[PDB]
Amino acid sequence: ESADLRALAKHLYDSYIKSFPLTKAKARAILTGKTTDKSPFVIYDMNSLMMGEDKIKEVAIRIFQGCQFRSVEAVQEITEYAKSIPGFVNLDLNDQVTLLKYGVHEIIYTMLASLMNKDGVLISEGQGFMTREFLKSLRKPFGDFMEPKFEFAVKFNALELDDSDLAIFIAVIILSGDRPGLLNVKPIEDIQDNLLQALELQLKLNHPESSQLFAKLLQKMTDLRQIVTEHVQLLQVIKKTETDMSLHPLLQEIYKD
Ligand SMILES: CCCCCCCC/C=C\CCCCCCCC(=O)O
Numbered sequence: 440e441s442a443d444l445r446a447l448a449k450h451l452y453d454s455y456i457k458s459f460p461l462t463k464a465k466a467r468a469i470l471t472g473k474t475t476d477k478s479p480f481v482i483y484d485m486n487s488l489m490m491g492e493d494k495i496k497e498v499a500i501r502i503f504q505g506c507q508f509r510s511v512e513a514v515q516e517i518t519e520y521a522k523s524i525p526g527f528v529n530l531d532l533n534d535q536v537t538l539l540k541y542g543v544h545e546i547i548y549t550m551l552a553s554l555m556n557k558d559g560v561l562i563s564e565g566q567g568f569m570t571r572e573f574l575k576s577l578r579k580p581f582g583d584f585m586e587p588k589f590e591f592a593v594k595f596n597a598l599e600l601d602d603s604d605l606a607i608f609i610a611v612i613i614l615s616g617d618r619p620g621l622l623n624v625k626p627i628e629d630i631q632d633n634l635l636q637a638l639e640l641q642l643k644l645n646h647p648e649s650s651q652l653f654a655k656l657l658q659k660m661t662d663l664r665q666i667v668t669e670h671v672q673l674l675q676v677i678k679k680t681e682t683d684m685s686l687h688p689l690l691q692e693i694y695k696d
Pocket residue numbers: 461502505506507508509560561562563564565569585
């Protein structure tokens with residue numbers, strides 16, 4: 440019954456709003472710097488960076504550890520969103536951990552696209568805007584940490600998804616079932632099928648003119664996988680080049696290679 444799929448879409452959108460303080464709709468109102476009620480301060484070099492906390496260790500490391508704390512906060516938000524996905528908390532506890540362990544970064548890069556345009560990325564809840572060129576000029580091991588996310592984002596953002604689309608989509612991601620180590624794949628897959636059914640109807644109704652958006656969105660889930668592996672490879676390099684630099688445990692636990 441399609442009525443039950445709209446109810447599910449509505450439930451997930453509502454819970455997405457409640458779980459994620461900075462939505463795509465807000466991010467776009469800020470980036471399209473004409474709804475000029477709170478425009479961001481723009482960090483594009485190191486002096487602007489120093490004026491940054493005049494409004495909002497080494498600089499590459501300092502930025503890296505700020506991005507690190509923001510991912511920790513993002514994991515907390517995604518985890519709270521996951522508990523609202525119907526059936527998720529009824530799954531075996533080990534599979535809950537495993538679904539979050541693998542789904543969390545794919546979601547993070549999906550949502551981080553909402554905060555990006557080709558030029559840069561919103562930061563500090565939207566108060567700031569760090570330019571892509573600045574991040575790309577960062578010292579050696581760090582300058583290329585964000586570029587593949589920007590590359591994904593400019594293409595993903597071309598789908599023109601809105602938050603109500605994304606709420607279903609990140610739910611689909613969490614409930615994969617092809618994750619390594621899942622103890623009971625079948626109840627996961629049944630939840631995902633209902634989610635997939637809900638996404639499909641949602642894209643049909645929300646984007647009637649956008650041909651095969653559902654297929655094209657599902658195909659973006661391979662871009663996400665590659666971002667993750669590239670990232671964990673980049674982390675291993677940092678763990679050995681800077682043995683003085685601490686990684687948050689929540690993020691350490693998520694990263695089991
Ligand atoms: C430092 C985070 C401030 C607390 C709330 C943050 C709200 C979410 C938005 C941006 C987080 C700030 C990111 C800090 C610099 C890293 C750049 C990045 O990769 O996003």
